[model samples]
Target chain A: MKAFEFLYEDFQRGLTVVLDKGLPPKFVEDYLKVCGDYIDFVKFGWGTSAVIDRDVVKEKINYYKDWGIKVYPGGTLFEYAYSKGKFDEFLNECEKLGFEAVEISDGSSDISLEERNNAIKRAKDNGFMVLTEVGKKMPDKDKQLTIDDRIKLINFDLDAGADYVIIEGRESGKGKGLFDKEGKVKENELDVLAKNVDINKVIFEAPQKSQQVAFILKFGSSVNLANIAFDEVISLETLRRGLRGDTFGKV
Target chain B: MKAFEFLYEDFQRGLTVVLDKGLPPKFVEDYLKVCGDYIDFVKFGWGTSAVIDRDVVKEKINYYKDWGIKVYPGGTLFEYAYSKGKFDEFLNECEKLGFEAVEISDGSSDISLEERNNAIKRAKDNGFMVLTEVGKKMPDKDKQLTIDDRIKLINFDLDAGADYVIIEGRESGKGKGLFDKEGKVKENELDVLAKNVDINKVIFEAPQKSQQVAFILKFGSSVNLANIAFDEVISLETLRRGLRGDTFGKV
Candidate 1:
């Protein structure tokens, strides 16, 4: 049913979670026309949900819901609430605002596994899909995390019943987790992750094209990816199908 | 009538031009509600207008037109058409698409000033506002252009009756015109453009926050800026008003 469908091999498209940092409602509606099927989830980035009107957030969520795509606020918000002892209010607000998933992360805050596991359990109990993130948001703090440390936390969240575990690459996709300051793959670290983690369960929040290409080539088209820009849906899909030059003979 | 109007020093808002790289029409419609007044132009970024459906392009431009925003295609398209000897058809298509402006440049192509001036005249004769760009799209090709070369071309375009001259920063805002490879300004080159060109008649195609801040701090709030990401409309406004930290108590 696709244009030039006969030319390419049937690609088992991977899970794609896009980052929405306060996009306009009608814009997303119109944008979804072309690549809505490619998107599996949409995360309202960082504290942006707090800045926009509740009605706008709800409208955007409803639009995503139309495509059967799960929607959640960024892990940063969950950390804010969890740290301030207002996690309950946060859940209540998310539910009222029509969010079906909750991202639990300690990206900018340090939280014990005790709290992380409990938060995941409670969110799951509240009928929300849980996505837990590994890696600190700050570069200096993130560098302190060994591949072993990241793997341990990734597995911990999965065992705690998170529907998906997101390896943090931040919004910039630079100097975070497996990416260097120039956004080059720390191939050594990537090799460790490839061998240690369940790539299927771990969504790499690789927002950059180079990082996305690297992940696709290493893990194939079925690697779950997050934090993609809204405009790049088709570009990513093309790469997944080996329609783009970078992944032409590779994926 | 602005929100928190009395809180800061009154600063003149600069001309803000955003790049529309195939956004959903309704999304732009909804986006205009928030910062419509701040935008002066909307460029359908580099061949993107050609990629989307004619109806969608017209619909998007119409939304911008509602806010009195002049709409135009990127200069690369003009260069492409001009190089291919479809200048007349390009003008026809732009008019049919409801574009009130046309950009003339040779960022990616070699065109004589004869052709450039003729294109500018035809676009202006067709009742379209004319904008001309002054830098190359490719890094190596761009670097060969000295500060004097850029300044001379800027004055030539202005004298040729081009309404505005844009110094190309491309989509990345780095390694082009006044920016270095890291997206930092070549301070010496910037000083040359600052001293020679009439800043009011020039729109610096600065797509990055750092570049926007530098231009704002150096030229005050009224410096014309282009290629702004749609979401940064408010952020740029804040910087211009000294509401953001970088330009606070400075601009």
Candidate 2:
């Protein structure tokens, strides 16, 4: 039973994706015990899997699975493998490391439309849930992508059999994707994307509190959000349940 | 021994103070195992004790103490207790809760020099390690205290039995105590304070990575810094050891 079971009414309903930028395996166990119920996926943030011990990564993944949370490596890692022409080896390693999903992205580099579609198909065929990302990691480069361009890419990924499409708002959530330099959502841009894509199959990378509150208030509590820091897990839940000062009466 | 024991020649010498807004007791143990040696104090952020259960708080404090880290409630909590005339009860609860220290602060409210002195002495008298803060919580209110005024209060607290006087930089470390609105250190103000006080006894509450990098580069690895997020503990350690890009070959 939850602490205030009466107030919840199944408030634990959002698809939350947290970023693990090299958290210890033992620590992951206890951390999961606290907020694991709310978390849906854990993405080992950009290239972290390469630095950490393979055994440690496996241990952390096991703990996450125990709590019923899916695990995947960051999209940057996928881009790295794709660029190296070792996409097959990457999937083999991801499967061996107990990752249930893979993020297919071109956030840091360019990907041909055909290659992007083929990569998505391959990951799905290998029995892995695929999440395709849209937009560039660089702020200036990301802005070059027009509203129509994003809608096209988003729809293309959906057609390519991606389980979900993530709008790129790096960990900073600043000046990237649908958010501006200050981490505020561009409502005009958001409206265009929301109108085009299936909102339920899209995750907004909202890392900041203001971003999280804005998205939850605008899209309701079940708005899919990703790249949230570990400590902000409960804070996010409260916002979803209207327990925080920001969403006290509204959410 | 550290991971890169060869590069860190006694680099783990600084006093690191991390903030705990509301972490689980079970999580603290595993968290400590990863970076406990680098952390010196764990502060239960303002009024967190009021929200958490007595048993849970004690369990978390016990976990901290097991790793040789002193535990204390935030300065704002001390100010809260002081304002309510429950300073004595606060100390009683601190001891019973297994906390080894107390923070004497006037961040949220005003404390006369006499009362401030009396409070510090009382905490010390109760055999608690004392840490007093030097500025108000509000940005404009904090700026009202001039450099000369802060120097006097800092020295006064030192004489009043405060083991360490924290340079006010609320958790945000922005536009408060020696920092600008952009969270940049006011070099002029810092020069005046550094010229007057015993630098070793002062802990600058640097919560940002840029601020941490600047201070470590300016003051070497042993600069006592507080209010660091739990996730940034290892990052700070890397910065201190000159392992990261910012401080590499510079520290």
Candidate 3:
């Protein structure tokens, strides 16, 4: 049972995906003791997986795997590989790093629709849970792709092989995706995407508290949230279970 | 002596209260290896003091005290006690917990001015350092307090035997006292505030990196700040020492 099992019924769909942005291995182990059970997935945020030692990455992945949590490299790694024509090496490297999930995203680069579908299928074929993302990292480029385009790419990835489609909210969650410059949700885009997508297969990457609150309010407490900072696991859980002040009576 | 003693000349003044929301005790020992020299107090945030074991809290406070860093219960606990009419017991319990400091505030409650002042005096008389806050936890309630009233409260608290007065930023540094809805400092009010106060005696509870950067730019990097999250201690120190991305080449 969880620490707050009574207050929360353990909403299975309400996944907590933490972005392990270059946290120390020993610290990660110690930190997990406090709120490990609350997390469902752990991503080595951005290209930090490449920056850290392979041993450290493997050790960290092993720790999360022991906790029954899936671990993956950032989507940027996938984009890097696809751009370099080293997609196979990327898949092999992910396996070597003990990554059970692989994020397939062209957030930083452009990929043809067929190529994107093939990448998703390739990741799936290698026994890795594929998580594809939509929306360009650059706001100008992101705006070029309409909400309809985001919905199309999302469904396309789902059809190809993605276990879940992560709506692009970068670490900052500002201007580049569904969020505005202030990181507030662009309600029209959000509503359009929400209406078209099967929310169960979608993970909204909300890194800020306001974004998390907004997504939770819009999608209910069980909204699948991703890219949450490691330290915020318990805080997010509190919000989900109506323990925190903001969501206390409302949730 | 501080690690970078040559960099920061004036370390004393308002209480530099760091937030120990839910950090592991062992990590605290590891973290103190870096910025512990500058920290004045560690607030085991909100009711988190009650969540951890008594022995852990006792040991943590002892460790901080050994470094001459005082530990205190958050104002929420004081509110909790005030609501329960166990304000005396609260101070007694704080002593039992090995806390060298106590924060007096009515952020979450309606403690009469007489009771609030009495609590401050009693804590001071009982050999504990008192840091009183003058801001509401709720944003609208906090906004209702005029800048003149806030400055008056700060002066009043100092006059009433309080060691330091904290302008509450409530950890997130957004939508609460001094900070606007966007966590931006109200420049006009801040200009007005600067006229009446000395920087040495006033500690801004800047919890965000941008807020820290703004404070450092406005009052120099040696600006005394509070509510710094433990993980960001090294980052904050770097910012002060002009090492981080935000303050790179600027400070």
Best by lDDT: 1
Which of candidates 1 and 2 reaches a greater lDDT? 1
Tens-digit lDDT string for candidate 3 (B1-251) = 65566766343233356888767667778778777866877887765565455666777787787789988877766776666667777777888778888888878678777787888899999999888887888776787898998898888788889888888888888888878878998788877778887656677899998888888777777677899877777678778767788877777
Give the candidate number with the greatest TM-score.
Answer: 3
Kindly report which residue pairs in candidate 2 clash with one another.
none
Model 2 lDDT vs. the true structure?
Answer: 0.84
| Cα lDDT of model 2 by residue, B1-251, tens digit | 76656665565357899988768677788789998988999887766555454666777888898989998887766765666677777788788788899988877677889999999999999999999988877676787999999899989999998999888887778888888999998888888877888989999999999999888877888899999999899999889878899988887
Per-model CA lDDT versus the true structure: 0.85, 0.84, 0.80
Over A136-179, each residue of candidate 3 has an lDDT whose tens digit, in order, gives 88887888988899889889999998999998889998887888
Structural similarity of chain A in candidate 3, as TM-score: 0.95
Q: Which of candidates 2 and 3 is the stronger one according to TM-score?
A: 3
Give the per-residue Cα lDDT of candidate 3 at A80.
88
Rank the candidate models, highest TM-score first. Answer: 3, 1, 2
List candidate 3 segments past 4 Å from native.
Answer: A1-13, A83-85, A110-118, A241-249, B1-14, B21-24, B47-62, B76-131, B148-165, B172-175, B179-204, B207-225, B229-251
Using lDDT as the yardstick, the better of models 2 and 3 is 2
TM-score of each: 0.63, 0.62, 0.75
